[PDB]
Amino acid sequence: GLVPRGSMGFKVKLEKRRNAINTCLCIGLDPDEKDIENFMKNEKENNYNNIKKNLKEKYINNVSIKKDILLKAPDNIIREEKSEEFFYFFNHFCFYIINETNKYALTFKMNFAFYIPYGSVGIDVLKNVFDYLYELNIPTILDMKINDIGNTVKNYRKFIFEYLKSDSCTVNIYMGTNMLKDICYDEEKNKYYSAFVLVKTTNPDSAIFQKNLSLDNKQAYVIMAQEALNMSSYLNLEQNNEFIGFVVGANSYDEMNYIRTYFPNCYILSPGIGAQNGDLHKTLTNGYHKSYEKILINIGRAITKNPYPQKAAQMYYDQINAILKQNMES
Amino acid sequence: SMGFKVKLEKRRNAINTCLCIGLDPDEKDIENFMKNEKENNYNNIKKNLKEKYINNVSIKKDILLKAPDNIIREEKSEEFFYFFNHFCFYIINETNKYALTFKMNFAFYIPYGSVGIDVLKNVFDYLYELNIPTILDMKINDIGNTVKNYRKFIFEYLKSDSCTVNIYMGTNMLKDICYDEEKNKYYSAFVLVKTTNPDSAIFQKNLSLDNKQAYVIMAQEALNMSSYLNLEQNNEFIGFVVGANSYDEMNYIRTYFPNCYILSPGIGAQNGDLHKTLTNGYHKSYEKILINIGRAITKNPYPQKAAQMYYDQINAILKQNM
Ligand SMILES: *c1cc(=O)[nH]c(=O)n1[C@@H]1O[C@H](COP(=O)(O)O)[C@@H](O)[C@H]1F
Ligand SMILES: *c1cc(=O)[nH]c(=O)n1[C@@H]1O[C@H](COP(=O)(O)O)[C@@H](O)[C@H]1F
């Protein structure tokens, strides 16, 4: 009755992990230039304490790109591999956050935008991060808010689900839901994949289209949620242990309440806690489901920019779990 | 330092078209080029190697400069890189004299990992050297802090002139895409208004605000944000993606926003009507109606001739409209 790592649908992988660690913390890994630069500076000041810990972890030997470089001594990188120094410290920063925080994470979400601005080098890092998370068996989300015509988006499907072997991604369906047939499904291989579509976002002006536009007294975010679930049903996702879920911001309390009320069993991904100042108690309460994996609370910068990310993660894990307990003991 | 508005106008004066050539090479296109080049003694690669501009690409130039016979024996790990990059150079070399702009869709450059991003960088370098105005089509959207990374990638790293953006999340994101307050830099973008996919009506037309369809609302907000940012005073603009199969919308947008910049994909592979699109979207400054053609050029076995006939037809249609 046992399924091996990598050989099950995302719904099953999330449920198993949720049973294991009893939380809905989603850790965001969005390293910026200052993060990387700082990591390098700190490691140089402390004889690379964290990099040396990274290098003892067994699965570093199972990443795809430039292991030859990643496994070098840090002082050899600095002295002998100058053109690889950035790749090295960027990738080791990522492994460091993962190693420090993974025991608290239901899922990691990596936002593509942070991995592209230096050109190809960050995509090598991103591939290694995904290979590493696959080896640890931690559920993954690639946050890329993708959108195009079907013929174009199948390239993103290949990158996200074949190359990175991601469990899921985020999608903006404003163009249409028909794009989902080329993202959540591969007709050639007959494989199904999971996604979170944008419903209500955290940016301060998100109401401008998501709540102002309507059809017959239903606001755009409700229509968009319904259309996404209609497409999920058509594609048979949940019967293949995948899903289409919703991104609903952690500062959008009324919309979280409406979505959980009107779509009782939907999967919700909620960014906005920490750096963006959303209210965790209100968000988790309004979006609560007794299957906690259906209300992922994403926290990025408030963990990754803390000097002690393991402790920051534990603190959020504990805060979330205390609110989960309040709801279980309602 | 020209500004995209100025780049477009000056190039329009030199080549007298509004053809925008799409460069979206897929795996089959690359494999076909490789196969064909092998069978025809690398005729096009050899032509590529004679062009001056190749000497100015940033990434792995020495690889790109090697003879194909040598690449396949002594740099085999670089074989895909080499043929992918050379396909792009071949298309650009064969068609550039007919292009007001080139538009590269990011999705085609990512699915193999980092390797395609090096190709994409070299492509922007090559176009920059040819001083051809550029668009990165990536339909970006996120919160402000996140999209700054796309501003850097697109406008600092690639040095693109412009990009496409999806503002459904909100318009304020444009402040962190089309503007860099630190450096006092301004950049141009086209925002999604009416798209070519067959179910595009579902949100763009069927949603409304006080009896105006969503696409009109979105277009107006994009121009509102352009005004706020003072783009046009800095020789830049926010414009509209309007499908070349969306005649009513193109008609309405050109009527209601008389001086707007439109990018129109959908001719060729997606069936759109060239005469109707150019007519409904027409402006005397015809750089304001970019007609994008991707696959109908790149998947044509005779791409110079395909580009030539779109150039010629656009020019006949432009004269009809005056
Ligand atoms: C995406 C959608 C949205 O509505 N908000 C939002 O922030 N995003 C992305 O989510 C995370 C937030 O991380 P943080 O904890 O550091 O604020 C980023 O990846 C952002 F791009
Ligand atoms: C983007 C928006 C849109 O409405 N339609 C559309 O096709 N796109 C992108 O535009 C071009 C079309 O190229 P084609 O000439 O090969 O059809 C592609 O880059 C597509 F992604």
XYZ file of C-alpha atoms and ligand atoms in Angstrom:
694
model
C 0.000 0.000 0.000
C 3.123 2.182 -0.183
C 4.021 4.646 -2.933
C 7.696 5.605 -3.399
C 9.068 9.182 -3.452
C 8.137 10.917 -6.734
C 5.511 8.325 -7.700
C 2.198 9.852 -6.656
C -0.024 12.834 -7.463
C 0.505 16.142 -5.672
C -2.721 15.847 -3.618
C -1.303 12.633 -2.130
C 2.179 14.060 -1.589
C 0.743 17.091 0.269
C -1.613 15.020 2.418
C 1.232 12.667 3.459
C 3.505 15.569 4.380
C 0.701 17.347 6.244
C 0.110 14.158 8.248
C 3.822 14.011 9.021
C 4.540 17.532 10.167
C 1.095 18.895 11.063
C 1.371 22.396 9.596
C 0.503 24.524 6.548
C 3.640 26.697 6.505
C 4.867 27.286 2.961
C 8.392 28.681 3.024
C 9.187 31.176 0.258
C 12.684 31.141 -1.194
C 13.094 34.409 -3.062
C 16.764 35.360 -2.633
C 17.652 38.859 -3.785
C 21.048 40.303 -4.675
C 21.485 41.693 -1.149
C 20.687 38.300 0.384
C 23.357 36.586 -1.751
C 25.933 39.333 -1.201
C 25.254 39.251 2.547
C 25.552 35.438 2.704
C 28.921 35.643 0.941
C 30.120 38.372 3.324
C 28.957 36.458 6.425
C 30.454 33.129 5.318
C 33.763 34.872 4.524
C 33.737 36.325 8.073
C 33.055 32.979 9.723
C 35.220 30.604 7.734
C 32.197 29.364 5.790
C 30.482 27.558 8.686
C 27.202 27.159 6.787
C 28.694 26.229 3.450
C 30.689 23.456 5.186
C 27.450 22.157 6.716
C 25.801 22.222 3.263
C 28.683 20.139 1.898
C 28.093 17.297 4.342
C 24.449 16.855 3.320
C 24.149 13.743 1.211
C 21.815 15.039 -1.505
C 24.144 17.792 -2.633
C 25.707 14.908 -4.605
C 22.453 14.442 -6.512
C 21.962 17.894 -8.039
C 22.349 18.199 -11.817
C 24.451 21.282 -12.520
C 28.145 21.955 -11.887
C 28.542 19.651 -8.849
C 32.287 19.904 -9.566
C 32.075 23.589 -8.604
C 29.451 23.287 -5.801
C 31.520 20.699 -3.923
C 34.763 22.664 -3.899
C 36.186 24.187 -0.732
C 34.935 27.810 -0.467
C 38.434 29.289 -0.322
C 39.231 27.473 -3.589
C 36.203 29.033 -5.181
C 37.258 32.525 -4.131
C 40.907 32.069 -5.209
C 40.675 29.707 -8.198
C 37.098 29.975 -9.553
C 36.401 33.705 -9.594
C 33.898 33.493 -12.460
C 31.916 30.856 -10.512
C 31.926 32.704 -7.176
C 28.450 34.193 -7.621
C 26.936 30.863 -8.790
C 28.533 29.144 -5.799
C 27.389 31.558 -3.067
C 23.925 31.979 -4.626
C 23.435 28.206 -4.742
C 24.855 27.685 -1.240
C 22.586 30.399 0.170
C 19.591 28.476 -1.180
C 20.831 25.104 0.167
C 21.476 26.823 3.531
C 17.917 28.157 3.850
C 16.546 24.733 2.794
C 18.740 22.827 5.241
C 17.949 25.201 8.108
C 14.155 25.390 7.607
C 12.882 22.279 5.773
C 11.741 20.380 8.886
C 9.064 23.062 9.383
C 7.919 23.374 5.757
C 4.805 21.751 4.271
C 6.014 23.198 0.935
C 8.702 25.485 -0.499
C 7.699 28.112 -3.097
C 10.431 29.593 -5.320
C 9.567 32.714 -7.279
C 11.144 32.549 -10.738
C 11.748 36.337 -10.906
C 14.576 36.058 -8.333
C 16.484 33.480 -10.379
C 16.516 35.192 -13.807
C 18.002 38.707 -13.400
C 21.661 37.643 -13.772
C 20.935 35.597 -16.890
C 21.643 31.860 -17.163
C 23.562 31.521 -13.859
C 20.449 31.810 -11.645
C 18.584 29.220 -13.731
C 21.357 26.740 -12.971
C 20.838 27.599 -9.271
C 17.056 27.154 -9.620
C 17.466 23.746 -11.300
C 19.775 22.656 -8.447
C 17.312 23.943 -5.822
C 14.535 21.903 -7.453
C 16.714 18.759 -7.755
C 17.681 19.174 -4.083
C 14.045 19.585 -2.919
C 13.050 16.549 -5.042
C 15.726 14.467 -3.312
C 14.509 15.667 0.137
C 10.929 14.994 -1.036
C 9.649 18.435 0.046
C 6.521 19.556 -1.933
C 7.339 22.382 -4.338
C 5.670 25.362 -6.000
C 7.276 27.384 -8.788
C 5.798 30.880 -8.475
C 5.865 32.367 -11.961
C 2.280 33.579 -12.505
C 2.548 32.320 -16.062
C 0.262 33.213 -18.958
C 0.217 32.853 -22.732
C -1.529 31.095 -25.601
C -1.620 27.273 -25.423
C 1.162 26.681 -27.970
C 3.485 28.982 -25.967
C 2.630 27.857 -22.439
C 3.467 24.205 -23.156
C 7.090 25.413 -22.996
C 6.508 26.536 -19.415
C 4.863 23.192 -18.638
C 8.021 21.444 -19.898
C 10.316 23.750 -17.947
C 8.300 23.600 -14.712
C 7.107 19.993 -14.621
C 9.711 18.058 -16.628
C 12.941 20.054 -16.242
C 12.464 21.298 -12.645
C 10.156 18.358 -11.728
C 8.056 20.887 -9.753
C 4.854 19.653 -8.089
C 2.973 22.798 -8.971
C 3.039 26.359 -10.270
C 1.071 29.632 -10.193
C -0.887 30.803 -13.234
C -2.676 33.987 -14.277
C -5.789 32.965 -16.253
C -6.925 36.454 -17.326
C -6.219 35.474 -20.946
C -8.549 32.460 -20.547
C -8.858 29.074 -18.862
C -8.102 27.144 -22.061
C -4.367 27.724 -21.361
C -4.767 25.307 -18.421
C -5.159 22.390 -20.872
C -1.499 23.037 -21.841
C -0.233 23.542 -18.273
C -2.138 21.094 -16.056
C -2.190 18.376 -18.711
C 0.270 16.906 -21.213
C -1.701 15.144 -23.927
C 1.373 13.515 -25.481
C 2.461 11.809 -22.252
C -0.966 11.678 -20.554
C 0.391 13.349 -17.378
C -1.501 15.701 -15.077
C -0.104 18.564 -13.009
C -1.264 20.962 -10.316
C -1.573 24.762 -10.329
C -2.751 27.707 -8.254
C -4.530 30.372 -10.311
C -4.582 34.048 -9.289
C -7.866 34.926 -7.550
C -7.164 37.807 -5.153
C -3.611 39.151 -4.923
C -1.765 41.100 -2.207
C -0.691 44.191 -4.106
C -2.262 47.330 -2.696
C -4.306 48.085 -5.868
C -5.494 44.511 -6.461
C -9.159 45.561 -6.306
C -8.831 47.571 -9.514
C -9.704 44.597 -11.734
C -10.281 41.672 -9.327
C -13.126 43.382 -7.463
C -14.209 46.279 -9.703
C -14.949 44.131 -12.767
C -18.054 41.962 -12.514
C -20.582 39.760 -14.322
C -24.172 39.850 -13.043
C -23.296 40.971 -9.497
C -20.436 38.500 -9.064
C -17.008 40.109 -8.885
C -14.201 39.014 -11.230
C -12.349 37.024 -8.556
C -15.407 34.820 -7.952
C -16.029 34.304 -11.695
C -12.330 33.471 -12.198
C -12.329 30.968 -9.290
C -15.466 29.256 -10.698
C -14.032 29.059 -14.210
C -10.812 27.529 -12.912
C -12.711 24.832 -10.991
C -14.875 24.176 -14.081
C -11.664 23.550 -16.031
C -10.327 21.310 -13.234
C -13.461 19.162 -13.472
C -13.244 18.925 -17.250
C -9.588 17.814 -17.088
C -10.310 15.183 -14.390
C -7.476 16.516 -12.196
C -8.672 15.431 -8.756
C -9.349 11.887 -10.010
C -5.657 11.839 -10.992
C -4.589 13.233 -7.613
C -3.818 16.743 -8.883
C -5.777 19.995 -8.490
C -6.328 23.556 -9.566
C -6.353 25.806 -6.538
C -6.421 29.514 -5.806
C -4.020 32.277 -4.798
C -5.819 34.431 -2.226
C -3.764 37.118 -0.441
C -3.212 37.066 3.338
C -4.543 40.631 3.532
C -7.833 39.886 1.709
C -9.884 38.699 4.638
C -13.367 39.095 3.159
C -12.409 37.411 -0.097
C -10.737 34.546 1.801
C -13.990 34.102 3.710
C -16.079 34.147 0.493
C -13.785 31.655 -1.291
C -13.691 29.157 1.598
C -17.466 29.587 2.102
C -18.430 29.160 -1.572
C -15.829 26.523 -2.538
C -15.585 24.574 0.734
C -12.936 22.057 -0.409
C -10.689 24.217 -2.587
C -6.892 24.434 -2.228
C -5.726 27.930 -1.260
C -2.190 29.399 -1.436
C -1.919 32.596 0.634
C 1.143 34.948 0.343
C 1.307 38.249 2.272
C 2.300 37.333 5.836
C 5.499 38.887 7.180
C 7.053 41.437 4.812
C 3.631 42.461 3.461
C 2.097 42.700 6.934
C -1.010 40.539 6.468
C -2.926 39.398 9.563
C -2.132 35.718 10.181
C -4.881 35.027 12.691
C -7.576 36.460 10.370
C -6.171 34.864 7.226
C -5.806 31.370 8.648
C -9.178 31.562 10.423
C -11.089 32.685 7.321
C -9.294 30.214 5.060
C -9.191 27.312 7.536
C -9.766 23.759 6.388
C -9.339 20.705 8.601
C -7.103 19.320 5.869
C -4.483 22.030 6.587
C -2.725 21.558 3.241
C -5.732 23.349 1.665
C -4.663 26.634 3.282
C -0.948 27.110 2.612
C 0.477 30.202 4.391
C 3.479 31.459 2.425
C 6.221 33.294 4.306
C 9.310 34.357 2.307
C 11.303 37.433 3.322
C 10.334 37.241 6.996
C 12.266 33.944 7.127
C 14.981 34.389 4.451
C 16.069 37.888 5.592
C 16.241 36.886 9.238
C 19.813 36.277 10.495
C 18.536 33.010 12.082
C 16.171 31.523 9.504
C 15.806 28.191 11.380
C 14.463 30.023 14.431
C 12.328 32.379 12.346
C 10.806 29.350 10.600
C 10.193 27.525 13.900
C 8.481 30.676 15.268
C 6.107 30.921 12.299
C 5.512 27.146 12.403
C 4.567 27.422 16.070
C 2.401 30.524 15.528
C 0.507 28.865 12.673
C 0.099 25.630 14.623
C -1.308 27.526 17.625
C -3.950 29.083 15.336
C -4.608 25.652 13.776
C -5.157 24.262 17.287
C -7.591 27.107 18.098
C -9.595 26.067 15.037
C -9.424 22.324 15.860
C -10.615 23.200 19.375
C -13.317 25.579 18.107
C 19.246 56.794 -24.365
C 17.085 57.440 -27.459
C 13.837 56.190 -25.887
C 11.694 53.482 -27.535
C 9.264 56.058 -28.942
C 12.152 57.661 -30.821
C 13.777 54.371 -31.830
C 10.500 53.247 -33.387
C 9.953 56.537 -35.246
C 13.499 56.641 -36.630
C 13.502 53.035 -37.727
C 10.063 53.527 -39.345
C 11.577 56.393 -41.362
C 14.420 54.174 -42.549
C 12.561 51.013 -43.527
C 8.951 52.128 -44.007
C 7.109 49.211 -42.393
C 5.366 48.115 -39.187
C 6.278 44.425 -39.490
C 7.374 43.010 -36.110
C 9.171 39.706 -36.630
C 8.557 37.133 -33.834
C 11.493 34.911 -32.933
C 10.010 31.965 -31.013
C 12.107 28.902 -31.968
C 10.766 25.602 -30.701
C 12.564 22.270 -30.210
C 11.387 21.073 -33.623
C 12.675 24.254 -35.309
C 16.130 23.799 -33.765
C 16.321 20.083 -34.565
C 15.176 20.741 -38.153
C 17.849 23.446 -38.598
C 20.523 21.066 -37.264
C 19.357 18.213 -39.510
C 19.157 20.461 -42.600
C 22.511 22.152 -41.965
C 24.155 18.736 -41.649
C 22.660 17.574 -44.954
C 23.575 20.758 -46.831
C 27.189 21.180 -45.613
C 26.331 23.887 -43.037
C 25.536 26.487 -45.690
C 23.634 28.869 -43.409
C 26.009 28.524 -40.447
C 28.861 29.365 -42.820
C 26.911 32.458 -43.917
C 26.344 33.378 -40.276
C 30.072 33.224 -39.605
C 30.741 35.855 -42.267
C 28.579 38.502 -40.584
C 30.438 41.154 -38.620
C 27.883 41.372 -35.789
C 28.592 37.836 -34.544
C 31.917 39.169 -33.223
C 30.033 41.164 -30.590
C 27.866 38.574 -28.815
C 28.644 38.273 -25.074
C 28.301 34.603 -24.221
C 30.543 31.813 -25.493
C 31.518 33.695 -28.645
C 34.525 31.460 -29.256
C 32.212 28.451 -29.362
C 29.864 30.225 -31.792
C 32.838 31.120 -34.002
C 34.062 27.505 -34.377
C 33.379 25.519 -37.532
C 30.415 23.109 -37.164
C 32.588 20.104 -38.036
C 34.702 20.960 -34.987
C 31.792 21.701 -32.628
C 30.284 18.272 -33.226
C 33.597 16.496 -32.448
C 35.361 18.594 -29.812
C 32.627 20.661 -28.150
C 29.719 18.209 -28.212
C 28.259 19.434 -24.929
C 27.841 22.834 -26.690
C 26.148 21.368 -29.760
C 22.605 22.328 -28.775
C 23.718 25.822 -27.700
C 25.540 26.311 -31.005
C 22.725 25.189 -33.281
C 20.022 27.026 -31.281
C 22.018 30.248 -31.333
C 22.858 29.815 -35.054
C 19.209 29.207 -35.943
C 18.380 32.562 -34.320
C 21.246 34.313 -36.085
C 20.135 32.748 -39.394
C 16.556 33.981 -39.021
C 17.745 37.474 -38.036
C 20.251 37.618 -40.913
C 17.694 36.475 -43.483
C 14.839 38.764 -42.324
C 16.112 41.857 -40.448
C 16.014 44.256 -43.403
C 12.190 43.875 -43.358
C 11.647 44.270 -39.593
C 10.662 47.417 -37.720
C 11.146 45.407 -34.523
C 11.887 41.863 -33.333
C 9.874 40.303 -30.515
C 11.309 37.300 -28.620
C 8.935 35.252 -26.444
C 10.745 34.236 -23.256
C 8.887 30.891 -22.979
C 10.864 29.492 -25.927
C 14.207 30.267 -24.335
C 13.618 28.660 -20.894
C 12.536 24.999 -21.333
C 16.090 23.553 -21.553
C 17.341 25.408 -18.449
C 20.150 27.977 -18.525
C 21.354 27.160 -22.055
C 18.430 28.967 -23.775
C 18.932 32.060 -21.630
C 22.502 32.378 -22.926
C 21.034 32.126 -26.446
C 18.454 34.787 -25.565
C 21.171 37.129 -24.238
C 23.235 36.697 -27.441
C 20.114 37.351 -29.531
C 19.487 40.668 -27.756
C 23.213 41.517 -28.091
C 23.049 40.730 -31.827
C 19.920 42.862 -32.360
C 21.409 45.674 -30.287
C 24.460 45.660 -32.612
C 22.143 45.728 -35.638
C 20.301 48.599 -33.919
C 16.961 46.895 -34.281
C 14.325 47.850 -31.674
C 13.341 44.944 -29.436
C 10.420 43.565 -27.447
C 10.684 40.792 -24.822
C 7.311 39.027 -24.756
C 6.932 37.526 -21.311
C 3.538 38.851 -20.174
C 5.006 39.525 -16.713
C 2.994 40.079 -13.581
C 3.728 40.155 -9.851
C 3.939 42.476 -6.855
C 6.249 45.507 -7.026
C 9.208 44.129 -5.087
C 9.230 41.014 -7.288
C 8.804 42.645 -10.692
C 11.870 44.839 -10.072
C 13.757 41.652 -10.894
C 12.085 41.530 -14.295
C 12.916 45.215 -14.850
C 16.584 44.330 -14.207
C 16.545 41.218 -16.375
C 14.698 42.774 -19.307
C 15.989 46.333 -19.299
C 19.469 46.098 -17.723
C 20.666 42.566 -18.543
C 19.081 42.001 -21.988
C 18.859 45.727 -22.673
C 15.482 45.230 -24.346
C 13.616 48.340 -25.493
C 10.282 47.034 -24.225
C 8.294 44.125 -22.819
C 4.739 42.818 -22.522
C 2.938 42.912 -19.171
C -0.286 41.475 -17.729
C -1.803 44.102 -15.386
C -4.704 41.987 -14.085
C -3.005 41.947 -10.653
C -2.984 45.739 -10.724
C -1.499 48.703 -12.598
C 0.883 49.903 -9.870
C 3.282 47.089 -10.851
C 4.124 49.288 -13.854
C 5.875 51.750 -11.533
C 8.473 49.016 -10.903
C 8.714 47.878 -14.568
C 8.612 51.062 -16.694
C 10.440 53.265 -14.184
C 13.596 53.148 -12.087
C 13.497 56.003 -9.594
C 17.060 55.366 -8.289
C 18.614 55.673 -11.765
C 16.011 57.985 -13.311
C 15.371 55.489 -16.131
C 12.154 54.916 -18.098
C 11.155 51.902 -20.194
C 8.289 50.963 -22.490
C 5.719 48.164 -22.201
C 2.669 46.783 -23.978
C -0.084 45.589 -21.622
C -2.548 42.793 -22.461
C -5.855 44.299 -23.680
C -7.468 41.790 -26.041
C -5.660 38.461 -26.624
C -5.789 36.003 -29.521
C -6.656 32.789 -27.669
C -10.016 31.354 -28.679
C -11.609 31.777 -25.214
C -10.329 35.348 -24.729
C -13.854 36.735 -24.360
C -14.380 34.938 -21.011
C -12.827 37.657 -18.859
C -11.796 40.371 -21.353
C -15.275 40.852 -22.815
C -17.759 39.141 -20.477
C -16.585 41.068 -17.395
C -17.494 44.751 -17.194
C -17.491 47.944 -15.144
C -20.611 50.089 -15.681
C -21.325 48.831 -19.220
C -17.736 49.057 -20.484
C -16.095 45.697 -21.182
C -13.054 44.761 -19.146
C -10.618 45.299 -22.014
C -11.578 48.997 -22.226
C -11.268 49.433 -18.461
C -7.793 47.837 -18.577
C -6.602 49.904 -21.553
C -7.734 53.143 -19.862
C -6.017 52.224 -16.581
C -2.784 51.442 -18.423
C -2.823 54.910 -20.018
C -3.704 56.462 -16.631
C -0.545 54.859 -15.217
C 1.462 56.011 -18.219
C 0.352 59.578 -17.448
C 1.242 59.222 -13.770
C 4.761 57.950 -14.737
C 5.287 60.675 -17.363
C 6.582 58.044 -19.796
C 5.814 59.810 -23.043
C 7.679 62.928 -21.945
C 10.663 60.623 -21.457
C 10.330 59.155 -24.941
C 8.700 55.928 -23.737
C 5.156 54.601 -23.653
C 2.672 52.110 -22.302
C 0.758 50.535 -25.190
C -1.674 47.700 -25.845
C -1.595 44.101 -27.009
C -4.672 43.785 -29.262
C -5.133 40.516 -31.196
C -5.090 40.544 -35.007
C -8.256 38.439 -34.904
C -10.102 41.014 -32.740
C -11.416 43.488 -35.281
C -14.169 45.152 -33.235
C -11.794 45.686 -30.322
C -8.976 46.933 -32.568
C -11.507 49.294 -34.176
C -12.742 50.530 -30.792
C -9.256 50.940 -29.327
C -7.911 52.891 -32.298
C -11.067 55.053 -32.317
C -11.190 55.699 -28.578
C -7.417 56.016 -27.967
C -6.451 57.711 -31.229
C -2.712 57.956 -30.603
C -2.036 54.693 -28.732
C 0.713 52.190 -29.524
C -0.640 48.743 -30.370
C 1.175 45.419 -30.734
C -0.936 42.923 -32.656
C -0.051 39.186 -32.693
C -2.249 36.618 -34.434
C -1.534 36.766 -38.195
C -0.228 33.622 -39.884
C -0.219 30.725 -37.446
C -3.407 31.943 -35.694
C -5.297 32.904 -38.856
C -5.826 36.650 -38.194
C -6.642 38.868 -41.179
C -3.786 41.153 -42.233
C -5.840 43.609 -44.304
C -8.584 43.985 -41.661
C -6.144 44.293 -38.759
C -3.931 46.896 -40.365
C -7.009 48.853 -41.548
C -8.865 48.899 -38.195
C -5.654 49.650 -36.286
C -4.150 52.050 -38.813
C -2.307 55.194 -37.835
C -0.207 57.523 -40.025
C 2.678 56.932 -37.633
C 2.365 53.242 -38.386
C 4.904 52.246 -35.720
C 1.750 52.609 -33.595
C 0.381 49.401 -35.136
C 2.996 46.663 -34.938
C 1.962 43.575 -36.888
C 3.694 40.628 -35.243
C 4.464 37.569 -37.332
C 6.307 34.677 -35.620
C 5.678 31.131 -36.818
C 4.564 32.148 -40.352
C 8.165 33.355 -40.761
C 10.215 30.999 -38.525
C 8.387 27.820 -39.650
C 8.515 28.853 -43.287
C 11.242 26.893 -45.108
C 12.049 30.133 -47.068
C 12.054 32.735 -44.241
C 13.635 35.662 -46.154
C 10.921 35.308 -48.794
C 8.162 34.953 -46.152
C 9.304 38.142 -44.403
C 9.606 39.915 -47.744
C 5.994 39.124 -48.672
C 4.611 40.351 -45.361
C 6.714 43.518 -45.760
C 5.404 43.973 -49.330
C 1.760 43.271 -48.410
C 1.898 45.533 -45.330
C 3.332 48.254 -47.538
C 0.566 47.847 -50.178
C -2.082 47.926 -47.410
C -0.423 50.955 -45.776
C -0.594 52.832 -49.072
C -4.306 51.978 -49.498
C -4.918 53.528 -46.049
C -2.693 56.419 -47.229
C 2.313 36.488 -5.683
C 0.958 36.834 -5.653
C 0.501 37.677 -4.632
O -0.702 37.991 -4.548
N 1.348 38.162 -3.689
C 2.656 37.800 -3.737
O 3.433 38.260 -2.863
N 3.116 37.000 -4.722
C 4.486 36.492 -4.607
O 4.428 35.811 -3.310
C 5.626 35.964 -2.546
C 5.499 36.787 -1.259
O 6.702 36.617 -0.506
P 7.075 37.494 0.805
O 6.707 36.623 1.980
O 8.565 37.675 0.694
O 6.311 38.791 0.718
C 6.605 36.528 -3.566
O 7.134 35.363 -4.247
C 5.712 37.367 -4.477
F 6.219 37.409 -5.736
C 0.707 36.862 -26.775
C -0.537 37.457 -26.587
C -1.553 37.126 -27.482
O -2.685 37.619 -27.380
N -1.365 36.248 -28.489
C -0.140 35.721 -28.686
O -0.008 34.889 -29.617
N 0.857 36.008 -27.827
C 2.203 35.581 -28.144
O 2.355 36.281 -29.414
C 3.128 35.531 -30.356
C 2.295 34.968 -31.529
O 3.217 34.466 -32.500
P 2.783 33.585 -33.783
O 2.968 34.518 -34.947
O 3.837 32.503 -33.877
O 1.378 33.116 -33.542
C 3.700 34.417 -29.513
O 4.947 34.886 -28.955
C 2.639 34.160 -28.435
F 3.248 33.696 -27.296
